T4 lysozyme
Amino acid sequence: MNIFEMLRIDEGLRLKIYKDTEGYYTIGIGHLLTKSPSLNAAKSELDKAIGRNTNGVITKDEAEKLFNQDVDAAVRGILRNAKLKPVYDSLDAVRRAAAINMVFQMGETGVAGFTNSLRMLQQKRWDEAAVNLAKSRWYNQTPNRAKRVITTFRTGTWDAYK
Ligand SMILES: Cc1ccc(C)cc1
Ligand SMILES: [Cl-]
Ligand SMILES: [Cl-]
């Protein structure tokens, strides 16, 4: 198991524009296109991202290309963030995958507001962090996914994904 396989499980794969859990236009493997309610705005963002007139549809290859870019970007986002970096550096390989998953899902902004969880993770207080992470809109909105990520931080294994 690795970050790509993990995220592919959590996000699925769709080759036609769709609405995410929050109702935002997305495509491929959780690639958010726009928060605007306009489908046209979404198709325009899509064409700009793929570099071609897609008509709201992409191939598997194109989806996988967006995915690679997105994972890379998340990691780099983390490494660039002064709040995040130190936490990420302190973690083991499995747990780093859980950190990347959250950043990918919610943005470095979103995750950067889990200050108290961050501190617990840095201190390696696993059970406590797990409890703290669950007290969130994130967990209440997407409970099955949050549970998987949380188990990951808690155990440092891929058990929730098998
Ligand atoms: C790097 C990192 C991001 C988010 C959390 C919750 C923990 C670590
Ligand atoms: Cl893009
Ligand atoms: Cl869920």
Q: What stands out?
A: The chain has nine helices and three strands. The longest helix spans residues 60-80. Residues 8 and 131 are 26 Å apart (CA to CA). The two ends are 9 Å apart (CA to CA).
